[PDB]
From a paper:
To focus on the function of Cys48 and prevent unwanted disulfide-bond formation at Cys73 during SDS–PAGE analyses, Cys73 was replaced with a serine residue in this study. To investigate an oxidized structure of Prx3 containing a disulfide bond, the crystal of the oxidized VvPrx3 (C73S) protein was obtained under crystallization conditions without a reducing agent. The crystal structure of VvPrx3 (C73S) [named oxidized Prx (C73S) in this study] was determined at 1.5 Å resolution in space group P212121 using the molecular replacement method. Hydrophobic interactions were observed in the C-type interface that appear to further stabilize this dimeric interface. Owing to disulfide bonds and hydrophobic interactions, a significant conformational alteration was observed in the active site of helix α2 containing CP and nearby loops. The A-type dimer in the reduced state is further linked by the disulfide bond between the CP residues at the C-type interface, which can lead to the linear oligomer observed in oxidized Prx3 (C73S) crystals.
Residue numbers in the entry:
A (entry chain A), B (entry chain B): 1 to 157
């Protein structure tokens, strides 16, 4: 998988705007910013709340107070589903990003096969990204109960 | 791995009673009964969407209504910890069983390595055991969001 100190893959993530589909080069979107990015295996799927959208929603103020410019949620889902999920969660403060063909996730080496559930999806992870460089990367290790969360990211700041 | 239709290996499970530590072959405990057995990776381990013991506690009367004689919970833990865990969850109904050296779990082929967390533990699974025969076996598959919860067992009944 990607290492700390490496620049993110020079790839895109998509978002639905009033302009239609926008494909953000992540290295442009995250340039000049301290960014918190977290991934889930799917929009609307269950994850310990502290480790995905609800956790980052309630910690958003504290994260921004410690210098985070942008908090973003990514998943192997399309941009319509990601928009709907943000709306359902009232994810005001969080940028919803779509990796619909799993290309960004595979470039990170953080894909996983869910077989009949949903095909290839993302592992759960969270990053602090400084000007496009991965500074902190925490990846779920479910068999050993490595129970990292938004607080883990807050403390890394 | 043990399979549906097979009879349990007569491996030992332990308990703490007024005699202190005691142990019995599992068929001494389960013969002549319809038993629901729920296994976890560890006592006091958290759940978010996975099956959990309080789910069996809430459905205990409905399980018994459908012919279950005994609801039991097993883990690779010792009997003092299993007793404490049962008390913490107000699980006086449920029989708390200890597989302290993982011999029962290994006999079933349902072990998993948790490495630095807790060494060798059990996968999360549930069984319906009719006079020693595993008539239903549901093993969790977290990557596909398949859970071995009490409702799954209730539907199998």
């Amino acid at each position: 998988m990607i290492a700390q100190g490496q620049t993110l893959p020079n790839a895109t993530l998509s978002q639905l705007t009033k302009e239609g589909m926008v494909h953000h080069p992540v290295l442009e979107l995250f340039a000049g910013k301290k960014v918190v990015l977290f991934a889930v295996p799917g929009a609307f799927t269950p994850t310990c709340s502290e480790a995905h959208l609800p956790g980052y929603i309630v910690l958003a103020d504290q994260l921004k107070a410690k210098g985070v410019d942008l908090i973003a949620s990514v998943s192997v889902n399309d941009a319509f589903v990601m928009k709907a999920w943000g709306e359902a969660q009232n994810a005001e403060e969080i940028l919803m990003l779509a990796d619909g063909d799993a290309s960004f996730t595979k470039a990170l080496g953080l894909e996983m096969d869910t077989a009949g559930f949903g095909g290839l999806r993302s592992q759960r992870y969270a990053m602090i990204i400084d000007n496009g460089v991965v500074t902190t990367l925490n990846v779920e290790a479910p068999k050993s109960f490595e129970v990292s969360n938004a607080e883990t990211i807050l403390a890394a700041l």
